[PDB]
Amino acid sequence: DEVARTDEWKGAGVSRLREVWDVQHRVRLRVLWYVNSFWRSRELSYDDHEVELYRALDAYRARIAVEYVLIRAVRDEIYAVLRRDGGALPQRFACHVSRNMSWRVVWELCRHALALWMDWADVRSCIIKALTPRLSRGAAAAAQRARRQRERSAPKPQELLFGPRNEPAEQTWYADVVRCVRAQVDLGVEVRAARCPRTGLWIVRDRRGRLRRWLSQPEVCVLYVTPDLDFYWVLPGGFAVSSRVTLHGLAQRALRDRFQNFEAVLARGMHVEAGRQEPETPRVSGRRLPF
Amino acid sequence: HPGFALTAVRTDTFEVDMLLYSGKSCTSVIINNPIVTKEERDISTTYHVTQNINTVDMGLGYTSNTCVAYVNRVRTDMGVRVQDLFRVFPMNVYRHDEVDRWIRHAAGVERPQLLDTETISMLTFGSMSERNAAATVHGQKAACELILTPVTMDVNYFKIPNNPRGRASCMLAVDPYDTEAATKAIYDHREADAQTFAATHNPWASQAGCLSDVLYNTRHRERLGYNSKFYSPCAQYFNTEEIIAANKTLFKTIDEYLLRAKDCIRGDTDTQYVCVEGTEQLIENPCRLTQEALPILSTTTLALMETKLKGGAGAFATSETHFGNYVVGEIIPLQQSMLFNS
Amino acid sequence: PKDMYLTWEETRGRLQYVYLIIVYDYDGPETRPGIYVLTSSIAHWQTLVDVARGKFARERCSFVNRRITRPRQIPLCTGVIQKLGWCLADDIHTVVRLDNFSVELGDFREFV
Amino acid sequence: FFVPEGLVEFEAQPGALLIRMETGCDSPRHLYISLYLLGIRASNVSASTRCLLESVYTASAARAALQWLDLGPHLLHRRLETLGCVKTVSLGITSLLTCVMRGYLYNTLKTEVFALMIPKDMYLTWEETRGRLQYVYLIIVYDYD
Amino acid sequence: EANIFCTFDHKLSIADVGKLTKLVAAVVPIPQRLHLIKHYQLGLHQFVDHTRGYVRLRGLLRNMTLTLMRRVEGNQILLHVPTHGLLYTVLNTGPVTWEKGDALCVLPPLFHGPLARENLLTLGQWELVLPWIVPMPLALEINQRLLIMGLFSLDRSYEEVKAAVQQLQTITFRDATFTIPDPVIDQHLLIDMKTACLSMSMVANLASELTMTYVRKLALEDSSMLLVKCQELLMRLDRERSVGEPRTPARPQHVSPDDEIARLSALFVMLRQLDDLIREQVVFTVCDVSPDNKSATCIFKG
Amino acid sequence: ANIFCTFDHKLSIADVGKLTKLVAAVVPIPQRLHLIKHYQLGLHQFVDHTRGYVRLRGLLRNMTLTLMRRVEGNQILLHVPTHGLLYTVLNTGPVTWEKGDALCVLPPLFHGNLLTLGQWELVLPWIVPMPLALEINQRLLIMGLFSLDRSYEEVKAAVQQLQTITFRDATFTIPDPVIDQHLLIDMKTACLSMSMVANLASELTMTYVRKLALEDSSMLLVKCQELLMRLDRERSVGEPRTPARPQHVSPDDEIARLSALFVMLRQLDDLIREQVVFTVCDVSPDNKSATCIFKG
Amino acid sequence: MENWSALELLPKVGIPTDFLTHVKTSAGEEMFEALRIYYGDDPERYNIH
Amino acid sequence: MENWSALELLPKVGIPTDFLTHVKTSAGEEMFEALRIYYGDDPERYNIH
Amino acid sequence: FFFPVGLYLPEDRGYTTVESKVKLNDTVRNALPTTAYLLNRDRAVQKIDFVDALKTLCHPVLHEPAPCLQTFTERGPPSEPAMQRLLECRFQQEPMGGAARRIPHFYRVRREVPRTVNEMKQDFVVTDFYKVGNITLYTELHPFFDFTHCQENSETVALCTPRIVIGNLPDGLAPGPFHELRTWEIMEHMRLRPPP
Amino acid sequence: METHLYSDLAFEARFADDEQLPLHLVLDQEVLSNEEAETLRYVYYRNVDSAGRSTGRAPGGDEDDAPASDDAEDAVGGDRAFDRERRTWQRACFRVLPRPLELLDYLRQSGLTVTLEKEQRVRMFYAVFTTLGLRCPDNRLSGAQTLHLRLVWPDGSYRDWEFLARDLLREEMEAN
């Protein structure tokens, strides 16, 4: 009888159940240990010197710290350009203002909101979420093509009179809303934005088109980031300070290890055609009989 | 008593001898000679003789009329046997097994059964899951209900012919071919409601997303896994898209009422299934035209029903009301002097 | 015969075709072939074989288990379909037998 | 009036406005364009209707008038001169139109009353209750943004 | 039983009855096999639903029974279900070249390429789309390419599967070109892959120690064109596996030919089981075609 | 349907006496044509030295068969049978019939009483019961597989054992597929195709059970993967360490593998299947003709 | 769709019409199938092709 | 698309129709405007609407 | 046909119009309706209770508000600008260890919290709650759950929470005296209608 | 249950190309919510080595150590950084049981025989059976390795849990 490995696998049973935690002690998942695995019959050696654990903890520290050192770089850039201009900032966002108004207290509230936002930074925030489309698959040719289409010459009448017809006035902006009447900070916020054609400033609405109405509230402050990594930090009254976010003091494979945007493969219920309207999810559920 | 109050509906089919009036030569019937077709069998020889007929109306308006005249028997039982939801949704089970087993032992349903595939449901017409009972002493049956609030004012919502949906969902009050005003009249709630000037009468029954709305809109039943063969008496009051599709000028609504808005209940089975485009009988339903249900005589206590039965003719017409007990009276004496009249 | 009859249906299809099906369960030492008469509303052969595979995958895993547990002994088949004819949904009679039966002596069509 | 073939799309139906546009050249220096071909210049027009009606004027002379509107130092109404409404075409390679200067619009033998057509985007009313009569006006309003 | 009557709901114009009367002796798929039917149950438009899967229509169309259209008289079309072995005639609506002596199958309507959208029947919210009566080698190629697109596309990113499927969807058959519209991954397609995988592994096990090395023996022996064109595939296989040399085969040690006969018999069983998943049944075998390829006659049922 | 088959040659009355013994025999015709010559009659239109066997079985799938009905002096009434109705055919092949046997049709390689003209001959296919047909089909196919190595002698004893065939009153000599130490070309493609299919069946399931068990993975896939491990362990036991299959494959080589597997599976349907033609009924005495139902 | 010119040109018969409701109401509520209600004097019945 | 049954059933004028090329050649190489070639014997001429 | 069973008439509007005819002993089982008596096809007193409605009351689709939540969240916030006052929630999450000293630090602000929706469903009396003067009627969807529209990370998200007991029903749909009579029925059930 | 055997045999058969070791897991309500476990598309693991980057790259040196330098054109390297980041993950098998259960009574309701030292009868509402791989470079193995569990839902979002190799084999490696 050439008896199968499956029956001796089951009848050999499982030795013991051992649970384990993660490093941050957030999840706690359990591990089985079957005796009839081939894990036993390879005769593995095992050892852990402490210097390797120290280097492992340092590498894991870097992997956790890449986001917060990016946020610290953002704060340093804010303070750098705020020292650089000399304290005089323009209004880059459309809001009607009054002249007789106390403005030193708005500066105090702006410093307060800046310290509060630095206290409550997280990996689920503006710059990380705006960075995730930049790490994608077709980002290189898309940015190259947008650069070439931006840097195209003035068209001659030949391509206007016989060539093909020519051709994104709104942008997908990401926002961190902080607020000091309640010390409530709001992290993952999406804002549709474009220019006001009557002037040269920006108009910020919802995806529904709400005309986002926190800018008139005197206590909030917002951080805006654009997909081309342009930077904005807007105190009430429409005045704001601008920069570029600088990530050049950071490694590349750390940025791809941490929050590189995901690419999916084909499972059941998915179109082998690329990009049609898919049907519903597979949805293996316990409410129904599982069929 | 739990913290709510369910209210039931039912469809009860009578047997009607309707009389028909028509003027002289209302239509013209064109016939021709019979046409034979020969079918060869091994022993027999069956000829199908055919003859085609064109009927042309010779009237401008409705030149011929009918009226419902005389009933002689009630086909259904007019009972209170509650509609089995576990057979019209045979798939939805509880997540934990033992509580599901305990509920199945609590109710009468034995086990969940798997719904059929798409191709099997293409070949067969429907499920017809439930069994004919052995002794069917009173006729077929239906009684389906809705969870309502116990503070529904009964005097205007259970004594007159009212739409049990929560709002007056009469589409004919809407100006025709207007789709926005229809959902403004039957779904929105920051405005008055027809026939009862509150916003609604049951917040668990009116708007989109009520358990009535998710349980008796047929599209919400297709969104989950439902059974098609069974007939829902609520379904004429909650299939919203059919009512929006019935938003025409009223002549066309009457034409669809006498042409397409007649229903199917098979007469032989013990429950009330639906016909599968059957040419046997089409059941005329005047409730679908008006979107209103009719209040039937209901009684809280035994003694009020006793003094209803002790009273003479027209005793069912009134509506007596004690402190915490109440009797709704029938708006038509079809329990008074139908079965006694025979 | 009430023992050999089975279905996976509410038997409310109009034209009920019939199918002889045998299997080869190798959970026994030699073989335990479960002979079966099967009605179905479905008429096409291949999709019926797919439904039967969905219903009889335990015999398939038993078949592969016989193949691994005994290499020298050849496994013969897994099962053979053969239609016999078709009837109507009211022609059944609860031993369940049929009053009318159109015949169609089809072929031994195997499946795994 | 004569017209090249590049402009007579959306013109085989009788009844449409016809405005002669100026052109700083010498030989084709006047050109007769329809109102619908002016629709690729109005900012009032939405994107859907514009991408519709620009996908019918993909000929030679239509884009030349489009360029000639956007090449001078002047405005539009210092280059547009209204002629009125057409009533018939002739459909050659150089189509012949018959515009109506003053009066009604009708067929020969008056058997058919032609109708003036205007696209939905340019239409504009300022009252919910129209009178027994209402006049029609052509409004050009400039956005000096 | 042999004749079924489908009645229309709408009134019929002259254009409607004129479009219908050109559809005499055409194919109509009917699911229900009832004696009298409405036009919503006619043809295929009751189940045509894109973004769902071509294999779904191929599965359900396989179950629907067929008929021919004759004796159209307005508000009735009198479909006639053909019985087995008798001689009937068929007009092909789909632009497929027909040849004599050929056997036909039924496939869901894959579009010709210009997307003509010739519904060839007008209702307000109903169309009469038709399945394509197709010769056997094209339908076999369709099932083969469908299963290849099914097996290949697992666990692949969109890039390589796009650059392969854009080649694989294009078919050619007698100066024509068609595509597969909704090739998506479905449950029936998945269980057909699992059965194909079981069958292929059974072919792997049930090969003897001499049929496995026959191509190696001929690769030592002969050099034809297809010898090279198969040897490159097996050589790339064995080179991606091992970076050694593909060994010369040895002498056959245990010869006992009843084992080889039973071995090839089990191989034949598993190979017919694998082959039936791409082969559809013959629904029409032709007798003679019109020289215009507009119609033909066929000796089979529906 | 009727077919009239005439002869342009002169027909001797002795050959009429030969032909009336073929009162009802199966003959194949390449296309259903109402009036036909005799050059399309039989299997003499496909005989040569180089094609041999598999070409005729492939060309027999698409030919339509027919039965001779009566004999006029210069035309033969051929009658195409239809399904369900029954006819009386003659036992042409060397095997004798029994009741209930499903009859299949096979090209007569061994054949060796036929109509004779100056360039045209008459040859009729063997009407054999289906189990014998599958039996000699797999016998010829294994005999074609062994064709490369007959320089050894126990394999010569093997093919000598495979040469004869056991049946009721039957010792036939199935002809050698390899002639002059060379194989005929269609059998060469057939044996090569089943060889390479047996190779790719080994070399692709090791990938595809991994590709498929990322879905719902029943015990069928588990025992399939263990069986594949048994095949791998018994394959490379006399070999170095392992074949060591990789995971990241080029897509187009996998396409060229799988399409080749299916397209060479496509050209083996004529050998793995059998056209059943007749299911026989009550036979005549001494078994030289029989009434049979045409199950086609 | 419907040649309404042939109704206005061919000689009719004279019938006493008795609509149920008012005839403009039965026109505006679409009891009948195909309507050609207008006002004034259409010259549509003259251009015969 | 004209009613070819009307051409079939109406009585025709017998003409010595003698053009230059073959009939199938002048048809299939598109000399005329709207062709309609049935090869068998179409029963569409027998359905009158 | 349709009919109610088990309703609750108000007590402050209570009356009797049949005094001379009926006289019921004053136990609570006659003072709270739980049955309904109808007539059959024959003139026969049939009876329906809550017991026989178990084929409907206990279905697992009745306790799944997920399609209800989906239909509630697709039509999102009320577009009425007059009622931009009730959709304000701040439902944060913070640690609890520092809370015992942050509780005098919470009132270091002098700015109030907006009113919650479930608070806003309780300041209507039994009879105006069905009128249009209520704002929260688009929140009451199901007798087993609480539906709301209020804000997380400055976006109005729909939130469906289950009413674990029957106390979370609003008083307009479930008034206090009704609970008192229900408890009186419970006390009659345990033979305790005179309590000690 | 049924995926653990298959993955055990798969890692056995694939052991010589990569010396991964099987790691049979169960996840429950402490990890992810039931709404997340009902639509869980597939899992992902990666055997990051002890001191450095990962397994899917070159051992010493690469072209991903450079700064990103804040450019628009090749914002992070280009497509090659995407290919290196996609190559380093491997897809483990996956099986989810979305009904409440008890693990030991489930495995005894299947064919297995659990002999635990004392009744640690764990209860849960939904059990997803996953099975990762962890590498040994040579036949020895360092405890300073770490894992990265990646759980993917079809919207594109994910979650990441990480834990070392030391705590995984703190007792079981010491039991052999």
Numbering used by the authors:
A (entry chain M): 298 to 464, 468 to 591
B (entry chain a): 1029 to 1370
C (entry chain g): 168 to 261, 273 to 290
D (entry chain m): 50 to 194
E (entry chain h): 5 to 306
F (entry chain I): 6 to 117, 123 to 306
G (entry chain B), H (entry chain Z): 1 to 49
I (entry chain a): 393 to 588
Sentences from the paper on this structure:
The C1 reconstruction of one-CVSC-binding penton vertex, determined at 4.0 Å resolution, revealed a CVSC structure essentially identical with that in the portal vertex: both structures are heteropentamers of two pUL77, two pUL48, and one pUL93 molecules. We finally obtained one 3D class (13.6%) that showed a tegument density similar in both strength and morphology to that of the periportal CVSC. Notably, the 13.6% CVSC occupancy of the peripenton registers in HCMV is significantly lower than that in HSV-1 (100%), KSHV (37.9%), and EBV (20.3%); albeit, HCMV contains the largest DNA genome. The heteropentameric CVSC of HCMV contains one pUL93 (467 of 594 residues), two pUL77 N-terminal regions (residues 2–81 for the upper one and residues 12–77 for the lower one) and two pUL48 C-terminal helices (residues 2221–2240). The helix domains of the two pUL77 molecules make contact with the two pUL48 C-terminal helices to form a four-helix bundle that sits above the front domain of the pUL93 molecule. For HCMV, the CVSC shows only one globular density located on the left side of the four-helix bundle. We assigned globular density to the head domain of one of the two pUL77 molecules. Instead of contacting with the penton, as observed in members of the α- and γ-herpesvirinae, the head domain of the pUL77 interacts only with the P2 hexon. Compared with the CVSC-absent (pp150 only) Ta, the CVSC-binding Ta is rotated ~120° counterclockwise. Accompanying this Ta rotation, a curved loop region (residues 1143–1165) of the P6 MCP, which contacts the right side of Tri2B of the unrotated Ta, is transformed into an extended loop-helix-loop region, with the helix tip (residues 1145–1151) inserting into the cleft formed by the Tri1 third-wheel domain and the Tri2A clamp domain.
